[PDB]
Design a protein around this ligand. Structure first.
Ligand SMILES: [Mn+2]
Length: 128
């Protein structure tokens, strides 16, 4: 929490976005915006200031893999961390996300304790 980061939480289910935002609040991260799919996420990211993305995978309009690829291709935002979120209903194409440079993976639903452990692993390995 003594880390100043603006998060973007992306999920097409409003209920899950709110859960994740509230978990972040429990961890002391109070600057957290939501987006409902990858297209919406672009509009947020282009406004600037974001430091970490937590993105669902399967979404209407633009999915999380396409979002990840678009971020990684961007000359300013190419290193933005992206934690990919998958659901138990379907195992996603992890090989493609690994190829594209996902920062990590987590299966929803999860608690704040799990999220914290995941975030800290990413902070440590990327050096932020
Ligand atoms: Mn989804």
């Amino acid at each position: 929490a003594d880390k100043e980061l603006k998060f973007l939480v992306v999920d097409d289910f409003s209920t899950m976005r709110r859960i994740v935002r509230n978990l972040l609040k429990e961890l002391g991260f109070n600057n957290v915006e939501e987006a409902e799919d990858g297209v919406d996420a672009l509009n947020k990211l282009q406004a600037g200031g974001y430091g970490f993305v937590i993105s669902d995978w399967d979404m209407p309009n633009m999915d999380g893999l396409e979002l990840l690829k678009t971020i990684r291709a961007d000359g300013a935002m190419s290193a933005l961390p992206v934690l990919m979120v998958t659901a138990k209903a379907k195992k996603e194409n992890i090989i493609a996300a690994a190829q594209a440079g996902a920062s990590g993976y987590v299966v929803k639903p999860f608690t704040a304790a799990t999220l914290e452990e995941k975030l800290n692993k990413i902070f440590e390995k990327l050096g932020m």
